[PDB]
């Protein structure tokens, strides 16, 4: 589990609208909320 | 008519989630918004 | 085709509540999203 790939919902040029974008983070960078869900 | 106990529906995290917390405010601190509804 | 009058809503006194409001903007101040849609 050196690197984890996943995405999140983030704001766009229009504040009301939102987009889904993928990013890569190291395993130790994030922590598990609990399955398959994490936060910084 | 001096102390008012109640809770306000506010969110800290989990954007699509709502959780209440109870706090006590003085009567003059909060003004009526309209019955049983107040505002800072 | 020089000044556009139109409606929208944004923040208000209370975060939860909403209010529809109207304002007049110049044609070159805003740009279309595409029909009958614009943004600053």
């Amino acid at each position, epitope marked *: 589990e050196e690197i984890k790939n996943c995405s999140f*919902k983030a*704001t766009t040029e229009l*504040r*009301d*609208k*939102k987009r889904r974008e993928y990013a890569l983070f190291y395993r130790l960078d994030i922590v598990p*909320l*609990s*399955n398959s*869900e994490y936060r910084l | 008519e001096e102390i008012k106990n109640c809770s306000f*529906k506010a*969110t800290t995290e*989990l*954007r*699509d*989630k*709502k959780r*209440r917390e109870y706090a006590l405010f003085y009567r003059l601190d909060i003004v009526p918004l309209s019955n049983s509804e107040y505002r800072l | 085709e020089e000044i556009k009058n139109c409606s929208f*809503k944004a*923040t208000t006194e209370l*975060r*939860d509540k*909403k209010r*529809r409001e109207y304002a007049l903007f110049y044609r070159l101040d805003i740009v279309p999203l595409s029909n009958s*849609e614009y943004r600053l």
Partner: antibody, heavy 129, light 105 residues
Framework: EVQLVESGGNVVQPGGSLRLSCTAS????????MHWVRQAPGKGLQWVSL????????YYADSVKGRFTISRDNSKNSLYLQMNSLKTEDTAFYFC???????????????????????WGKGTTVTVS | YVLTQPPSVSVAPGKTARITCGGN??????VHWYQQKPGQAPVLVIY???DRPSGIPDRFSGSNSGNTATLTISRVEAGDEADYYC???????????FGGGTQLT
């Protein structure tokens, strides 16, 4: 006190089209989002479609995203949901329900829209073939 | 994302009903219960798991914590002989899912 009325249902055939009219009054559509669900006999509720005041947040359910479109207008305050390419397992009573449209705004996170039906209509009818 | 409501429940008059709206990590999502009577459209009875709308019988409360979302009823009466449904909004999966209901005696 609000009322929702729907009409236009009748016998239908697979591969055909039907026009459904759903007028309502008592609450302005300017700040109201309308939902759509169906209630087949012996089964639970199923989400059909969602629509916002003008556009965006018009998300559709996974199983009914094929060629289904929902449109809204402010001139006469009504809604439509035209049935197209009817299957042989999508027959049920379609229900349109009002939504409160509550929201919330944090400078960092942004607008967050909550969804939960408040008012419900009488109900429509569908009969494949 | 799906719910795991019980298939049926039996509560004789004078007892309390413990209807549950099962769901994985449902404590992180709000649950709204509905009454689905036969012959007329459903009416919302609970929203945000604590609030309560107007024009409703009193003593209608619900609890939502852990892995189970439970609805509380008291002095059960034959007028409520219908099916209960719970609604939850999901953004990660990007769809709304309703449970299969639970038959009542």
């Amino acid at each position: 006190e609000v009322q929702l009325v729907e009409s236009g249902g009748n016998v239908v055939q697979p591969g055909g089209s039907l026009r459904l009219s759903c007028t309502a009054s008592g609450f302005s559509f300017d700040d109201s989002t309308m939902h759509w669900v169906r209630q087949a006999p012996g089964k639970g509720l199923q989400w059909v479609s969602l629509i916002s005041w003008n556009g965006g947040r018009t998300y559709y359910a996974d199983s009914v995203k094929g060629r289904f479109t929902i449109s809204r207008d402010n001139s006469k305050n009504s809604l439509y949901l035209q049935m197209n390419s009817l299957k042989t397992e999508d027959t049920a009573f379609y229900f349109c329900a009002k939504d409160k449209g509550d929201s919330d705004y944090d400078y960092n996170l942004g607008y967050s829209y909550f969804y939960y039906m408040d008012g419900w209509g009488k109900g429509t009818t569908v009969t494949v073939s | 994302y799906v719910l795991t409501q019980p298939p049926s429940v039996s509560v004789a008059p004078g007892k309390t009903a413990r209807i549950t709206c099962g769901g994985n990590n449902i404590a992180n999502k709000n649950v709204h219960w509905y009454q689905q009577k036969p012959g007329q459209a459903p009416v919302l009875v609970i929203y945000y798991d604590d609030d309560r709308p107007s024009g409703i019988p009193d003593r209608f409360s619900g609890s939502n914590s852990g892995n189970t979302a439970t609805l509380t009823i008291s002095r059960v009466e034959a007028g409520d002989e219908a099916d209960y449904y719970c609604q939850v909004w999901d953004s990660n999966s990007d769809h709304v899912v309703f449970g299969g209901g639970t038959q009542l005696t």
